Amino acid sequence: EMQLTPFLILLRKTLEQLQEKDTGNIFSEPVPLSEVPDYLDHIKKPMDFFTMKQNLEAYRYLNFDDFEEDFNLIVSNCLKYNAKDTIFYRAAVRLREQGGAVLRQARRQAEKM
Numbered sequence: 001e002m003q004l005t006p007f008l009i010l011l012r013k014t015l016e017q018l019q020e021k022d023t024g025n026i027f028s029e030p031v032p033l034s035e036v037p038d039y040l041d042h043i044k045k046p047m048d049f050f051t052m053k054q055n056l057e058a059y060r061y062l063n064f065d066d067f068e069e070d071f072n073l074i075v076s077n078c079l080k081y082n083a084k085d086t087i088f089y090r091a092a093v094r095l096r097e098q099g100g101a102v103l104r105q106a107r108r109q110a111e112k113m
């Protein structure tokens, strides 16, 4: 029960803040299926920040859970696919921690609407 425009503005800002935490840009675009040919054997639903931006602008995220679910997919897919001793796995841990904090403050802003 709120106005759509300010909510989408908030999600845009939040997505930018999450992208800033991914300093290696490992989650900016889909995992290249040509470069990782076995990726879909293990990962049911790929996700990345560019796809999230497209979903946001297609009005596919109408509540904070919609948005956070796709962020969580970025993280969980990376933890699932990559071995624990890799930069990629640790980058997902870091994003979960740092991006979680961004998400908690942003959800609080949405609740004020």
Ligand SMILES: Cn1nccc1C(=O)Nc1ccc(F)cc1F
Pocket (backbone or CB within 6 Å): 026, 030, 031, 032, 035, 036, 078, 081, 082, 088
């Ligand atoms: C499996 N994975 N999770 C996050 C990033 C990747 C990944 O394999 N990225 C990657 C690896 C080699 C490349 F040439 C390009 C990539 F985007």
